[PDB]
Amino acid sequence: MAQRAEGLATVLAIGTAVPANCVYQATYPDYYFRVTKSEHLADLKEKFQRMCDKSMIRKRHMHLTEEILIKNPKICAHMETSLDARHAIALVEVPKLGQGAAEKAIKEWGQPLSKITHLVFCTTSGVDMPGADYQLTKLLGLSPTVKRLMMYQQGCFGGATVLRLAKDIAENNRGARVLVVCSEITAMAFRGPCKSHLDSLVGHALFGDGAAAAIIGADPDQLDEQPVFQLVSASQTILPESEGAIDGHLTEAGLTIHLLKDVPGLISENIEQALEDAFEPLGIHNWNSIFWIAHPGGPAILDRVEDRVGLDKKRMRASREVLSEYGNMSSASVLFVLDVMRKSSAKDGLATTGEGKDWGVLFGFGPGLTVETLVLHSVPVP
């Protein structure tokens, strides 16, 4: 009873990092078909051009350069034996990018490394033992007694999952300060285009690299810590009739994506039930009276959710800015959206970190099809 915290798990800091290499969407169909030596696939290239034109992405950050692809031609093939070459990149770069994000969150938070009691590391980009959690513990110099959770092969709802894990840890352990880190490197999934896998082609229009980190704790110090958001509740559901809508396989040829059914339609037709299950207990029913942190999976998911739920254009603005500037960074994306939301809220002189609203919703979407729903509370901005 005295070993547990009293109040709600709170986000006390958010930091983000991306590879320096920036790939512009306007020139990407030419780049992708040239470096994979696929320019004879002219009809496929035109299909890819239309996907990039509709993507609502301006740029992505990618560790993978043409120099790396030239040294790894089997990564350029659609489905060649290449997992070992991909792991040799991702098992180093995932924790290093995570280090970049974690250092920025720790600097914002301003407390000593010794106060971090727990680490949750989440990725979809390769697996190893010991894990990225161990590697980051060594890179940052965390205490050897840090309690670690290594969340591997999670997918796009992982950002929601690490907040749900951190909420229970922070609330149940007095003094606990949880470092959460999501880090994604597309070198695990990047491959040449193929007419038989148009879903892989969609992935190559959307997926980017990035890492995000947060410090989560309950009972924040009034003077030395600064709340950004509160984590109120977390729910998860498998959508009806969604079997196989999003599958991801780690194979001899790296990570491959498989899409069936209508992912935007399945999510959009179930989202209102997720909102009601989360918000009815709080007496909230106007979805325009809350701020929105939607996983920016792609423009069709944000468009169909906005349309079906009846959102004003401003609700999806922060999610769309992440999509525009970074693409889909799988598990890291929602932490980027949280960061954009609080920064743009303060910049626009609004009264709270959540666009001047009190209550907010965070959605992750991924394989299952799984929807993770978190209720958030904003904090006042001076």
Which residues are known catalytic residues?
156
Binding partner selected for residue 298 from a second copy, ligand COA, ligand NAR, none, CB under the kind-specific 5 to 8 Å limit: ligand COA
169, 182, 206, 334: which one contacts a second copy (CB under 8 A)? 169
What part of residues 246-305 is at the interface with ligand NAR (CB under 6 A)?
246, 248, 255, 257
The neighbouring-strand residues paired with 245 are none
Number of residues that bind a second copy (CB under 8 A): 55
Site track for a second copy across 56-75, x = CB under 8 A: --------------------
What part of residues 199-218 is at the interface with ligand NAR (CB under 6 A)?
203, 207-209
CA distance to 68, 171, 173, 225, 366, per residue, from 7 (Å): 48, 7, 11, 14, 30
Based on the shown chain and the rule CB under 6 A, indicate whether residue 249 belongs to the binding site for ligand COA.
no
**H or E segment and range at residue 30:** helix 28-35
By the 8 A CB rule, do 135 and 126 touch? no
Sequence-ordered list of residues with C-beta below 8 angstroms from that of 261, at least 6 positions apart, any chain: 241, 242, 244, 245
Based on the shown chain and the rule CB under 6 A, indicate whether residue 186 belongs to the binding site for ligand NAR.
yes
What part of residues 64-123 is at the interface with ligand COA (CB under 6 A)?
none
Based on the shown chain and the rule CB under 8 A, indicate whether residue 165 belongs to the binding site for a second copy.
yes
CA distance 67 to 16: 25
CA distance 184 to 331: 7
Please, what is the minimum distance in Å from the beta carbon of residue 360 to a second copy? 19
**H or E segment and range at residue 250:** strand 246-251
Pairing of strands 118-122, 22-24: unpaired
Based on the shown chain and the rule CB under 6 A, indicate whether residue 25 belongs to the binding site for ligand NAR.
no
CA distance 159 to 156: 7
106, 149, 302, 338: which one contacts a second copy (CB under 8 A)? 149
Based on the shown chain and the rule CB under 8 A, indicate whether residue 134 belongs to the binding site for a second copy.
yes
Binding partner selected for residue 278 from ligand COA, a second copy, ligand NAR, none, CB under the kind-specific 5 to 8 Å limit: none
Binding partner selected for residue 47 from ligand COA, a second copy, ligand NAR, none, CB under the kind-specific 5 to 8 Å limit: ligand COA
CA distance 335 to 342: 11
What part of residues 320-349 is at the interface with ligand COA (CB under 6 A)?
328
What part of residues 43-102 is at the interface with ligand NAR (CB under 6 A)?
none
By the 8 A CB rule, do 328 and 206 touch? yes
CA distance 257 to 201: 10
Based on the shown chain and the rule CB under 8 A, indicate whether residue 161 belongs to the binding site for a second copy.
yes
188, 250, 334, 371: which one contacts ligand NAR (CB under 6 A)? 188
Sequence-ordered list of residues with C-beta below 8 angstroms from that of 265, at least 6 positions apart, any chain: 304
235, 282, 324, 350: which one contacts a second copy (CB under 8 A)? 235
What part of residues 27-56 is at the interface with ligand COA (CB under 6 A)?
47, 50-51, 54-55
Query: CA-based Rg of the chain, rounded to a whole angstrom?
Result: 20
Q: Cβ closer to ligand COA: 30 or 224?
A: 30
Based on the shown chain and the rule CB under 6 A, indicate whether residue 306 belongs to the binding site for ligand NAR.
no
What part of residues 156-185 is at the interface with ligand NAR (CB under 6 A)?
156, 184-185
Sequence-ordered list of residues with C-beta below 8 angstroms from that of 181, at least 6 positions apart, any chain: 98, 101, 102, 119, 120, 121, 122, 136, 162, 211, 212, 213
Residues forming contacts to ligand NAR in the complex (CB under 6 A) are 124-125, 129, 155-156, 184-186, 188-189, 203, 207-209, 246, 248, 255, 257, 329-330, 366-367
